[PDB]
Amino acid sequence: CVATRNSCKPPAPACCDPCASCYCRFFRSACYCRVLSLNC
Known part of the structure; x- marks a missing residue:
């Protein structure tokens, strides 16, 4: 899965808990x- 302090690494169903997503800086x-989400 895509963890909090880890590069975006497939095959992955987003992150390990469902309210977190992959966030880039430059390409x-x-x-x-x-x-990012307030409820989920």
């Missing part, structure tokens, strides 16, 4: 899992 550089 594919610095892509780490992020809890």
Whole structure:
């Protein structure tokens, strides 16, 4: 799965708990899992 301090690494069903998603900086550089949602 795509963990919180880890690069976006498939085959993965998003992150290990369902409210976090992969968040890049520059094309594919610095892509780490992020809890953006307030409820889910």
